[PDB]
Design an enzyme around this catalytic site. Structure first.
Site, PDB file in Angstrom:
ATOM      1  N   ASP A  35       0.833  -1.199   0.000  1.00  0.00           N
ATOM      2  CA  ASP A  35       0.000   0.000   0.000  1.00  0.00           C
ATOM      3  C   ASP A  35       0.872   1.255   0.000  1.00  0.00           C
ATOM      4  O   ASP A  35       1.368   1.672   1.053  1.00  0.00           O
ATOM      5  CB  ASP A  35      -0.887  -0.016   1.235  1.00  0.00           C
ATOM      6  N   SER A 199      -0.623  15.659 -11.931  1.00  0.00           N
ATOM      7  CA  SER A 199      -0.875  15.316 -13.316  1.00  0.00           C
ATOM      8  C   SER A 199      -1.119  16.583 -14.122  1.00  0.00           C
ATOM      9  O   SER A 199      -1.648  17.580 -13.619  1.00  0.00           O
ATOM     10  CB  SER A 199      -2.097  14.401 -13.391  1.00  0.00           C
TER      11      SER A 199
END
EC number: 3.4.23.22
Length: 330
Positions: A35, A199
């Protein structure tokens, strides 16, 4: 040193991936959920409340000649999905794919919430976010990667998750045969303890690319892609009959639909998520309403590039002094 381990989807939807991890001496192999959105290595154990164990493999520290109680240390974690676990702490030898760390903090669960009990395939979590998020008290502990870093050939790990197939976590090297083209690197902020990046935009299907900064985290422990409501609405508007259902808990779409791809920007590069990766199947057995793999982050507080996005790429988690993320197509 290096390590390399195969990671395997837990079910036919790729809801999560499990990777075998050797703990203790002799080794006890547990299948952990790696994770990158958390920083605790915790396991089902011989200390876990018996009614909260249902099929998981447990770590028994009393059977490990290298286990040592970390005296006074406790841990307690709550995840973004509302699940939680807590317990005490041992140090022990932990190996992943041939890479061994001695003295790793292994957090033994005394209590786990129902979603963990109900998932017999996941024996615990191995956190790969920054150690500043580790919950052990009163002495915070380091992640497996942080402990291994100095010994690694290069201070990196890579995630290469499969679509409906196994993939690979590598430590200490970048397998140049595992991706196509070049890897585009992008800056990381560690201010929140995550692999947080920005992004450069998105496209829906064959539509034009929208240049817009989307801050979010690379999180292998989250199944879906959670993005701003504007972006998610633009995606689902291209699927006839798709709608957001408050009762179901997100966007659903007719199972008869063909889904468009979704592209996200990494610098000037582009990662394309095929439409099929966005199909999470019937909302309940036999239903013709299917659950979408792109969902709004509006109720979370952070955008999350979970498995839906990451499995479309070869992803480099560069833990050098100035961390960065790398993405390549594959």
């Amino acid at each position: 040193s290096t390590g390399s381990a195969t990671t395997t989807p837990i079910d036919s939807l790729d809801d999560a991936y499990i990777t075998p991890v050797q703990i203790g001496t002799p080794a006890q192999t547990l299948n952990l959920d790696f994770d990158t959105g958390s920083s605790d290595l915790w396991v089902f154990s011989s200390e876990t409340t018996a009614s909260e164990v249902d099929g998981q493999t447990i770590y028994t520290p009393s059977k490990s000649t290298t286990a040592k109680l970390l005296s006074g240390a406790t841990w307690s974690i709550s995840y973004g999905d509302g699940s939680s676990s807590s317990g005490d702490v041992y140090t022990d030898t932990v190996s992943v794919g041939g890479l061994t760390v001695t003295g790793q903090a292994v957090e033994s669960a005394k209590k786990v919430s129902s979603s963990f009990t109900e998932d017999s395939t996941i024996d615990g979590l191995l956190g790969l976010a920054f150690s500043t998020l580790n919950t052990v008290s009163p002495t915070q502990q380091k992640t497996f990667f942080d402990n291994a870093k100095a010994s690694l050939d290069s201070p990196v790990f890579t995630a290469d998750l499969g679509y409906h197939a196994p993939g690979t976590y590598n430590f200490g090297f970048i397998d140049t045969t595992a991706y196509t083209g070049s890897i585009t690197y992008t800056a990381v902020s560690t201010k929140q303890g995550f692999w947080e990046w920005t992004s450069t935009g998105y496209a829906v299907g064959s539509g034009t690319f929208k240049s817009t900064s989307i801050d979010g985290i690379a999180d292998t422990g989250t199944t879906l892609l959670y993005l701003p409501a504007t972006v998610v609405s633009a995606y689902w508007a291209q699927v006839s009959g798709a709608k957001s259902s408050s009762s179901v808990g997100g966007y659903v779409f007719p199972c008869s639909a063909t889904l468009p791809s979704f592209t996200f920007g990494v610098g000037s590069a582009r990662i394309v998520i095929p439409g099929d990766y966005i199909d999470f199947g019937p909302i309940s057995t036999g239903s013709s309403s299917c659950f979408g793999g792109i969902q709004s982050s509006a109720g979370i507080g952070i955008n999350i590039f979970g498995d839906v996005a990451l499995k479309a790429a070869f992803v480099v988690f560069n833990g050098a002094t100035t961390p960065t993320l790398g993405f390549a197509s594959k």
